[PDB]
Design a protein around this nucleic acid. Structure first.
Ligand SMILES: NC[C@@H]1O[C@H](O[C@H]2[C@@H](O)[C@H](O[C@@H]3[C@@H](O)[C@H](N)C[C@H](N)[C@H]3O[C@H]3O[C@H](CO)[C@@H](O)[C@H](O)[C@H]3N)O[C@@H]2CO)[C@H](N)[C@@H](O)[C@@H]1O
Ligand SMILES: NC[C@@H]1O[C@H](O[C@H]2[C@@H](O)[C@H](O[C@@H]3[C@@H](O)[C@H](N)C[C@H](N)[C@H]3O[C@H]3O[C@H](CO)[C@@H](O)[C@H](O)[C@H]3N)O[C@@H]2CO)[C@H](N)[C@@H](O)[C@@H]1O
Ligand SMILES: NC[C@@H]1O[C@H](O[C@H]2[C@@H](O)[C@H](O[C@@H]3[C@@H](O)[C@H](N)C[C@H](N)[C@H]3O[C@H]3O[C@H](CO)[C@@H](O)[C@H](O)[C@H]3N)O[C@@H]2CO)[C@H](N)[C@@H](O)[C@@H]1O
Ligand SMILES: NC[C@@H]1O[C@H](O[C@H]2[C@@H](O)[C@H](O[C@@H]3[C@@H](O)[C@H](N)C[C@H](N)[C@H]3O[C@H]3O[C@H](CO)[C@@H](O)[C@H](O)[C@H]3N)O[C@@H]2CO)[C@H](N)[C@@H](O)[C@@H]1O
Ligand SMILES: NC[C@@H]1O[C@H](O[C@H]2[C@@H](O)[C@H](O[C@@H]3[C@@H](O)[C@H](N)C[C@H](N)[C@H]3O[C@H]3O[C@H](CO)[C@@H](O)[C@H](O)[C@H]3N)O[C@@H]2CO)[C@H](N)[C@@H](O)[C@@H]1O
Ligand SMILES: NC[C@@H]1O[C@H](O[C@H]2[C@@H](O)[C@H](O[C@@H]3[C@@H](O)[C@H](N)C[C@H](N)[C@H]3O[C@H]3O[C@H](CO)[C@@H](O)[C@H](O)[C@H]3N)O[C@@H]2CO)[C@H](N)[C@@H](O)[C@@H]1O
Ligand SMILES: [Mg+2]
Ligand SMILES: [Mg+2]
Ligand SMILES: [Mg+2]
Ligand SMILES: [Mg+2]
Ligand SMILES: [Mg+2]
Ligand SMILES: [Mg+2]
Ligand SMILES: [Mg+2]
Ligand SMILES: [Mg+2]
Ligand SMILES: [Mg+2]
Ligand SMILES: [Mg+2]
Ligand SMILES: [Mg+2]
Ligand SMILES: [Mg+2]
Ligand SMILES: [Mg+2]
Ligand SMILES: [Mg+2]
Ligand SMILES: [Mg+2]
Ligand SMILES: [Mg+2]
Ligand SMILES: [Mg+2]
Ligand SMILES: [Mg+2]
Ligand SMILES: [Mg+2]
Ligand SMILES: [Mg+2]
Ligand SMILES: [Mg+2]
Ligand SMILES: [Mg+2]
Ligand SMILES: [Mg+2]
Ligand SMILES: [Mg+2]
Ligand SMILES: [Mg+2]
Ligand SMILES: [Mg+2]
Ligand SMILES: [Mg+2]
Ligand SMILES: [Mg+2]
Ligand SMILES: [Mg+2]
Ligand SMILES: [Mg+2]
Ligand SMILES: [Mg+2]
Ligand SMILES: [Mg+2]
Ligand SMILES: [Mg+2]
Ligand SMILES: [Mg+2]
Ligand SMILES: [Mg+2]
Ligand SMILES: [Mg+2]
Ligand SMILES: [Mg+2]
Ligand SMILES: [Mg+2]
Ligand SMILES: [Mg+2]
Ligand SMILES: [Mg+2]
Ligand SMILES: [Mg+2]
Ligand SMILES: [Mg+2]
Ligand SMILES: [Mg+2]
Ligand SMILES: [Mg+2]
Ligand SMILES: [Mg+2]
Ligand SMILES: [Mg+2]
Ligand SMILES: [Mg+2]
Ligand SMILES: [Mg+2]
Ligand SMILES: [Mg+2]
Ligand SMILES: [Mg+2]
Ligand SMILES: [Mg+2]
Ligand SMILES: [Mg+2]
Ligand SMILES: [Mg+2]
Ligand SMILES: [Mg+2]
Ligand SMILES: [Mg+2]
Ligand SMILES: [Mg+2]
Ligand SMILES: [Mg+2]
Ligand SMILES: [Mg+2]
Ligand SMILES: [Mg+2]
Ligand SMILES: [Mg+2]
Ligand SMILES: [Mg+2]
Ligand SMILES: [Mg+2]
Ligand SMILES: [Mg+2]
Ligand SMILES: [Mg+2]
Ligand SMILES: [Mg+2]
Ligand SMILES: [Mg+2]
Ligand SMILES: [Mg+2]
Ligand SMILES: [Mg+2]
Ligand SMILES: [Mg+2]
Ligand SMILES: [Mg+2]
Ligand SMILES: [Mg+2]
Ligand SMILES: [Mg+2]
Ligand SMILES: [Mg+2]
Ligand SMILES: [Mg+2]
Ligand SMILES: [Mg+2]
Ligand SMILES: [Mg+2]
Ligand SMILES: [Mg+2]
Ligand SMILES: [Mg+2]
Ligand SMILES: [Mg+2]
Ligand SMILES: [Mg+2]
Ligand SMILES: [Mg+2]
Ligand SMILES: [Mg+2]
Ligand SMILES: [Mg+2]
Ligand SMILES: [Mg+2]
Ligand SMILES: [Mg+2]
Ligand SMILES: [Mg+2]
Ligand SMILES: [Mg+2]
Ligand SMILES: [Mg+2]
Ligand SMILES: [Mg+2]
Ligand SMILES: [Mg+2]
Ligand SMILES: [Mg+2]
Ligand SMILES: [Mg+2]
Ligand SMILES: [Mg+2]
Ligand SMILES: [Mg+2]
Ligand SMILES: [Mg+2]
Ligand SMILES: [Mg+2]
Ligand SMILES: [Mg+2]
Lengths: 49, 223, 159, 58, 148, 51, 185
RNA sequence: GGAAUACUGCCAGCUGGGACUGAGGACUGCGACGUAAGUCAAGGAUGCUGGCAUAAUGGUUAUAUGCCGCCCGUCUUGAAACACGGACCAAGGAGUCUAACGUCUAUGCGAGUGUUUGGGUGUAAAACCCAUACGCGUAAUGAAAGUGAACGUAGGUUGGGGCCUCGCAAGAGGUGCACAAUCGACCGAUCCUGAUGUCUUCGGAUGGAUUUGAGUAAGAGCAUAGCUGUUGGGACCCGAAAG
RNA sequence: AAAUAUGUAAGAAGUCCUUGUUACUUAAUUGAACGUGGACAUUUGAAUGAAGAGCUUUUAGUGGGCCAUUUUUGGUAAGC
RNA sequence: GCCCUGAAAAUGGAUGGCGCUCAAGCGUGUUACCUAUACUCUACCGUCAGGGUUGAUAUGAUGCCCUGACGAGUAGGCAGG
């Protein structure tokens, strides 16, 4: 309902949002593996920058 | 150092010896002051009787009020009054200077208290046994005139009988001399209240009202 | 249905006195009101314009404004627990001149003139008022007045 | 169903706990609701009596 | 954390802190902003006046940065000159070699008129300056150059 | 630490009001008073005993 | 039983030590608690109380607020005391010398205090130089300048500002905000 | 006519019996008795004698006796109720997490603040490090085009702690930050006046105004965090007839 | 025309003396406010009390009530 | 005045109960006496308030010490555990 003196918020969570939710636990491995993916490119690509 | 602190002590010891002389002075002068006055009044009655006329005494300037009712179920206006007279607890009492200002504070309070005109003894034994004083809150027993003088000294009143005098004689500093006094915590009457039922007026059933001189027999038994 | 409109219940209240009616005399119009004046509020039924609401009848306040035909009066009324500040725009037929403070001035002024008597003599002042007192001892003369003694009267029917 | 309608019971009590306050007055009250052409001219009477002390002190 | 939370204090007391008469139900009053015009009227006026209805004019496909005018005041100004040089330029007070301050390249592009500045002159490179701003720059013996 | 009660415990009776010593010595709570011979006006016994 | 004319077992609203755990802050208090007790100096009492204050009650005292206070007549040379952190203000230009005893000084504050040739004293140093706090000028930052204090007491006709998340038109300007839509406030 | 006696009242008059209590733990106090040495009942019990280790005494527990004591939990104005749940025991069993927030508090830095989108780096989800941006704050106000905060030591009057001057003091004088009341100035909006100029309709100087703003007037904020409170969420737990 | 209940005052923000401002006001140095400079404290201007005075933010529960004396309405009355 | 008539209801039954007749009844007076978680005095626990104190010499400055007042509680809040 509506009480006290508080700004009106808008929270769009009526939609089954708990279905589409992405945590990034992979931020580590999606970097460690984002590096190794670049590291071996330049390897395979040889002096080119 | 041994001489220096000895100088404070040897002089202070002498300051007190003389400060106690000021007292014996006054209290002996107080003893005459009362002894003559009552003797005056006692005589003036007899004279007027020999003259055919009647000595009509001065109405009483000083009254002692002990609250005989509990703290429950009291109407607001009496309830506020009992607080302003500093009786918030059963069987407690204060002194009141009689004036048509405070006289109306009584009589409005009449349902919840018994009161009357206290004697010298009654005041003396009330202050001697039950006498306390107010120093930054802090209910403090008057065990020494130093306590009194430290506080009531700015008014005179360096004795405990200086307090007693300033009360019974009323007089200029009675407001602060009486207000200095903590309200008197008293026991129930030793030997009962004399009535069956307290909350009929003294004239009808006993207690609860102005019993005039009969306040002394009561208060003394509550002491 | 309940009826709460502005002047309800004022029937006897806004009535003019028995054998006083019609035009209001000129002392009312000829009075001067500056700011700070303490005025008593009593409505007048003959004058409908600029009259107090029935509440402020009997109340006394300090005029905060002076206009052509009226004076604004600030009054203190309680709502819930507090006093808010009401200010009324009232005409002069509804305004008295309060005698509450008037004597206090005649008190101060007499107090300062009795101060010069302790300045020119040096006796004690006794300025602040003291309430009525226990009285005093006296002697009542039996000369020419000897107490006459009464008893209670019996019962008898008077009709 | 039917129930209570109104009462003032206990309201004096509630309004005396923290209650009844006081008008909390100050010196120099607000001028709210005073004649405009007083409070207009009153500005310039004070605007002018300013310069009087913007001279005297030097 | 939980061990700090009052609902551990309430273990053992019937009804948590929620009351015996009114309990804690699902949705008394209705979910969300329901009834703002009716039973919540008193709360929408008082703490959110103006909440209902329309005011003014719409804008279709409005894109900010058509409006971009970060605001800067003579109140600052000289901050845009690095600290040490700021000294000797204030010491100079020259109409011959005088410091150049490019406001737009400094994160800005409207110069306002708040607050006093020294008599030391400034070359103000800007766009959109306020009338009182400039005139106060003329008191320092300096100019404004409009750019884009 | 302990309030003692000048109505008993002579020591504190003397600690306050040193006049107590005199008062005791002189009796003075037993003080006799000068005898008077005054007799009431015969009107006063007329009213008193009257009716 | 007593009829109580005031509420039993009520505690006074004032703090005693701070709520902060900072071990150095707790020491400065141990200092100035001792000071305020064994002196006649009222200044020590004042500083002691101000040591318990909360970051909302110790708003930053700007250097320009210090400067203008030295332009006070007769206070020119006094060492000024701020029981909270002191901020730099670029808005001034010529800033006098003095010395300023505070808890903390921002980097700009400190360095620019010394450019004018003045000291940043730390509160115990100030205590040793001035055990009775003599020739000291105490300064306070504004506590009603705060954001949250703008929304306090938000009624009809109170001209305060509402708790509001976005802002612009479309947001709380229509019904109740003008005579044209509903009423106005 | 001279007492006596009753009655009421005062004595800082003298004495006998009983009861409960012995808190404190060097000395500091106020006193009293003293010619004095000194003594004391004077800011809280010491002296003396006896009795007890197969134990006196104290704890628990069972039983008895005197008096007392209705079943909890719940709703309710009112329950022991002829109101509802509960035959018993063990285990399980109900205000959570999330996103956005209000007050308050602690902390970092402060006219700024936020490393963690990303990059570097690594003893590899850690820790350490960093460019460009971005977010919020540093300007408001109009619906909008727009315009955009110093007449004055950033004001006047009245209060104000602290600091200062003389004063034993008591007071007095001085400065007066936060803060309170109030009179002003300033920025925007609204209405009014409409200058020098202009390509004749542009430009809007100056000066008013019971109008107005979530503004200015030697900045306070940004960030991580705790309790409590708000909303969206299965949303304290269990429960419909239905669709 | 009561009783009871009820608004106001009992001071240093006081009572006065003088005379500067203004666009208001007057026949007008008439006023009105607001100032400048100055006269007076010692019961500082009733009693009584004050367990301290003022201020701010936030937030729980509650929003079925019932009883006694008294005043009181409907009802023959009621544990209405 | 007291008492009597007036004065008829359903299980057996209630001045609370036995029972009381110059009362152990009714009206009135005067004293003694009994005992509440109330009043007075004191010990102890806690809460709130005021004051002293690391000038120290260990072992706690959130301490140690002195003083005064106070203590009902559902829904509910907060604190210390
Ligand atoms: N407003 C959006 C964002 O909200 C964030 O909110 C953070 C806090 O406000 C929030 O705290 C909530 C609190 O709001 C709420 N009223 C009480 C709750 N106990 C707190 O939650 C906290 O404690 C719980 C219990 O251990 C933890 O599990 C939780 O991770 C922790 N944040 O935890 C949030 C982080 O998970 C931040 N305020 C900020 O990043 C930003 O404002
Ligand atoms: N009359 C001496 C005065 O001393 C003042 O300064 C000293 C003291 O008088 C004053 O003491 C406090 C004061 O801090 C506080 N803000 C008010 C407080 N009433 C004052 O206390 C004063 O009054 C109380 C009560 O009567 C007395 O117990 C105390 O001895 C006395 N100094 O604070 C200073 C010491 O800390 C002022 N210099 C000035 O008013 C005047 O010179
Ligand atoms: N600082 C970041 C910027 O902030 C903006 O918001 C700030 C301002 O731009 C915004 O003001 C709006 C503005 O959005 C819009 N384009 C024009 C409008 N007239 C302005 O509104 C202005 O006046 C209204 C009353 O009319 C006030 O309510 C409002 O506070 C005021 N800023 O109000 C905010 C200041 O209070 C944008 N919301 C945001 O997207 C952007 O990133
Ligand atoms: N009942 C008399 C009262 O006197 C009061 O007057 C008090 C104040 O107005 C007056 O204060 C003056 C102040 O006006 C002036 N602008 C500064 C001056 N230093 C102050 O002086 C006062 O305070 C200082 C500082 O603590 C003390 O040293 C000094 O003793 C004291 N007179 O000092 C008086 C207190 O001594 C008020 N006018 C009012 O509350 C009331 O009329
Ligand atoms: N309007 C300008 C103002 O006029 C003021 O003067 C006008 C009044 O205020 C002034 O009157 C003074 C008054 O100021 C002061 N406070 C009291 C004094 N009793 C008055 O005096 C007045 O009464 C006396 C007789 O009682 C007459 O003789 C006299 O003419 C009359 N003006 O007399 C003028 C006309 O009545 C002052 N000069 C000054 O404040 C200012 O210049
Ligand atoms: N101890 C019994 C006494 O009688 C009282 O109660 C009495 C009344 O309840 C009852 O009186 C009723 C009357 O109400 C109803 N009309 C029926 C019956 N015939 C009457 O009975 C009466 O009879 C005559 C008078 O009529 C009397 O002499 C007689 O004493 C009385 N009992 O008779 C009871 C016994 O006399 C009380 N129980 C008690 O307080 C009192 O002490
Ligand atoms: Mg009398
Ligand atoms: Mg009294
Ligand atoms: Mg009288
Ligand atoms: Mg007995
Ligand atoms: Mg009895
Ligand atoms: Mg009896
Ligand atoms: Mg006795
Ligand atoms: Mg006794
Ligand atoms: Mg009607
Ligand atoms: Mg009439
Ligand atoms: Mg009449
Ligand atoms: Mg009309
Ligand atoms: Mg209904
Ligand atoms: Mg009903
Ligand atoms: Mg209802
Ligand atoms: Mg109805
Ligand atoms: Mg409260
Ligand atoms: Mg816990
Ligand atoms: Mg619990
Ligand atoms: Mg339980
Ligand atoms: Mg509960
Ligand atoms: Mg349960
Ligand atoms: Mg709760
Ligand atoms: Mg429940
Ligand atoms: Mg509810
Ligand atoms: Mg909308
Ligand atoms: Mg004791
Ligand atoms: Mg108690
Ligand atoms: Mg301010
Ligand atoms: Mg402000
Ligand atoms: Mg407004
Ligand atoms: Mg916003
Ligand atoms: Mg419309
Ligand atoms: Mg309309
Ligand atoms: Mg004879
Ligand atoms: Mg004879
Ligand atoms: Mg006798
Ligand atoms: Mg003897
Ligand atoms: Mg012992
Ligand atoms: Mg001795
Ligand atoms: Mg001797
Ligand atoms: Mg001797
Ligand atoms: Mg000796
Ligand atoms: Mg032995
Ligand atoms: Mg046993
Ligand atoms: Mg039983
Ligand atoms: Mg139930
Ligand atoms: Mg039910
Ligand atoms: Mg029911
Ligand atoms: Mg209930
Ligand atoms: Mg009912
Ligand atoms: Mg039950
Ligand atoms: Mg039943
Ligand atoms: Mg049920
Ligand atoms: Mg059941
Ligand atoms: Mg069943
Ligand atoms: Mg079951
Ligand atoms: Mg069952
Ligand atoms: Mg079973
Ligand atoms: Mg938060
Ligand atoms: Mg990894
Ligand atoms: Mg940035
Ligand atoms: Mg303009
Ligand atoms: Mg100008
Ligand atoms: Mg000012
Ligand atoms: Mg001032
Ligand atoms: Mg003095
Ligand atoms: Mg225009
Ligand atoms: Mg202008
Ligand atoms: Mg600001
Ligand atoms: Mg909170
Ligand atoms: Mg289900
Ligand atoms: Mg289904
Ligand atoms: Mg359907
Ligand atoms: Mg003039
Ligand atoms: Mg008092
Ligand atoms: Mg609330
Ligand atoms: Mg509610
Ligand atoms: Mg309900
Ligand atoms: Mg009923
Ligand atoms: Mg009933
Ligand atoms: Mg009945
Ligand atoms: Mg029968
Ligand atoms: Mg029988
Ligand atoms: Mg009986
Ligand atoms: Mg029988
Ligand atoms: Mg029988
Ligand atoms: Mg019996
Ligand atoms: Mg009898
Ligand atoms: Mg007997
Ligand atoms: Mg007990
Ligand atoms: Mg303490
Ligand atoms: Mg309790
Ligand atoms: Mg309680
Ligand atoms: Mg409890
Ligand atoms: Mg509970
Ligand atoms: Mg514990």
């Amino acid at each position: 309902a509506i009480s006290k003196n508080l700004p009106i918020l808008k929270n769009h969570f009526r939609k089954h949002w708990q279905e589409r939710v992405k945590v990034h636990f992979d931020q580590a491995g999606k970097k460690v593996s984002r590096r190794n993916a670049r590291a071996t490119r330049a390897a395979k690509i040889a002096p080119r920058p | 150092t041994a001489e220096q602190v000895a100088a404070e002590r040897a002089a202070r010891k002498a300051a007190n010896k003389e400060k106690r002389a000021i007292i014996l002075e006054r209290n002996a002068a107080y003893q005459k002051e009362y002894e003559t006055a009552e003797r005056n009044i006692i005589q003036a009655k007899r004279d007027a009787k020999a003259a055919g006329s009647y000595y009509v005494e001065a109405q009483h300037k000083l009254v002692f009020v002990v609250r005989i009712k509990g703290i429950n179920k009291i109407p607001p206006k009496p309830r506020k009054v009992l607080q302003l007279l500093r009786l918030t607890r059963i069987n407690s009492g204060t002194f009141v200077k009689v004036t048509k200002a405070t006289l109306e504070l009584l009589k409005l309070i009449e349902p919840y208290v018994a009161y009357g005109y206290p004697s010298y003894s009654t005041i003396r034994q009330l202050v001697y046994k039950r006498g306390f004083g107010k120093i930054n809150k802090q209910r403090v027993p008057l065990s020494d005139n130093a306590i009194i003088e430290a506080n009531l000294g700015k008014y005179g009143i360096l004795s405990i009988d200086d307090l007693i005098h300033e009360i019974i004689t009323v007089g200029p500093h009675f407001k602060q001399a009486n207000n200095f006094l903590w309200p008197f915590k008293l026991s129930n009457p030793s030997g009962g209240w004399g009535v069956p039922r307290k909350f009929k007026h003294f004239i009808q059933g006993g207690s609860f009202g102005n019993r005039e001189e009969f306040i002394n027999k009561l208060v003394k038994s509550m002491n | 249905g309940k009826s709460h409109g502005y002047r309800s219940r004022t029937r006897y209240m806004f009535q003019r006195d028995f054998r006083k009616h019609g035009a209001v005399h000129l002392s009312t119009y000829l009075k001067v009101y500056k700011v700070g004046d303490i005025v008593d509020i009593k409505a007048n039924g003959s004058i409908q314009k600029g009259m107090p609401h029935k509440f402020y009848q009997g109340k006394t306040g300090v005029v905060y404004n002076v206009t052509k035909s009226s004076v604004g009066v600030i009054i203190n009324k309680m709502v819930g627990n507090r006093y808010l500040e009401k200010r009324l725009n009232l005409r002069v037929e509804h305004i008295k001149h309060s005698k509450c403070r008037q004597e206090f001035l005649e008190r101060v002024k007499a107090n300062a003139a009795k101060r010069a008597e302790a300045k020119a003599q040096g006796v004690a002042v006794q300025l602040k008022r003291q309430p009525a007192q226990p009285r005093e001892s006296r002697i009542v003369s039996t000369e020419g007045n000897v107490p006459q003694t009464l008893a209670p009267v019996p019962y008898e029917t008077f009709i | 169903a039917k129930s209570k309608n109104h009462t003032a019971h206990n309201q004096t009590r509630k309004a005396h706990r923290n209650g009844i306050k006081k008008p909390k007055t100050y010196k120099y009250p607000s001028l709210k609701g005073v004649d405009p052409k007083f409070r207009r001219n009153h500005k310039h009477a004070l605007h002018g009596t300013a310069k009087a002390l913007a001279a005297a002190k030097k | 954390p939980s061990r700090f939370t009052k609902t551990r204090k309430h273990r053992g007391h019937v009804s948590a802190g929620k009351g015996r008469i009114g309990k804690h139900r699902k949705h008394p009053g209705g979910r969300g902003m329901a009834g703002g015009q009716h039973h919540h009227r008193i709360n929408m006026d008082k703490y959110h006046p103006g909440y209902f209805g329309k005011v003014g004019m719409r804008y279709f496909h409005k894109q900010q940065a058509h409006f971009w005018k970060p605001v800067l005041n003579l109140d600052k100004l000289w901050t845009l000159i690095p600290e040490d040089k700021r000294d000797q330029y204030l010491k100079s007070a020259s109409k011959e070699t005088a410091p150049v301050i490019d406001t737009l390249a400094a994160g800005y592009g409207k110069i306002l008129g708040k607050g006093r500045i020294p008599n030391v002159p400034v070359i103000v490179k800007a766009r959109f300056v306020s009338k009182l701003a400039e005139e106060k720059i003329r008191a320092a013996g300096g100019v404004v150059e409009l750019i884009a | 630490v302990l309030k003692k009660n000048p109505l008993k415990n002579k020591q504190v009776l003397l600690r306050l009001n040193p006049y107590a010593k005199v008062f005791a010595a002189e009796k003075l709570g037993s003080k006799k008073a000068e005898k008077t011979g005054t007799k009431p006006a015969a009107v006063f016994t007329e009213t008193l005993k009257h009716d | 039983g007593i009829d109580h004319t005031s509420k039993q077992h009520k505690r006074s609203g004032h703090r005693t030590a701070p709520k902060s755990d900072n071990v150095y802050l707790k020491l400065l208090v141990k200092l100035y608690t001792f000071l305020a007790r064994r002196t006649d100096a009222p200044f020590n009492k004042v500083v002691l109380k101000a040591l318990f204050l909360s970051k909302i009650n110790r708003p930053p005292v700007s250097v320009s607020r210090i400067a203008r206070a030295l332009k006070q007549e007769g206070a020119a040379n006094k060492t000024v005391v701020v029981v909270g952190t002191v901020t730099d203000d670029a808005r001034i230009f010529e800033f006098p010398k003095t010395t300023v005893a505070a808890l903390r000084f921002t980097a700009g504050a400190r360095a620019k205090i010394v450019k004018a040739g003045g000291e940043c004293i730390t509160l115990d140093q100030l205590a040793v130089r001035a055990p009775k706090g003599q020739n000291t000028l105490i300064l306070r930052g504004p506590r009603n300048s705060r954001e949250a204090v703008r929304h306090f007491g938000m009624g009809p006709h109170k001209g305060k500002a509402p708790r509001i998340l976005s802002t612009g038109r479309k947001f709380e300007r229509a019904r109740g905000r003008r005579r044209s839509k509903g009423f106005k406030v």
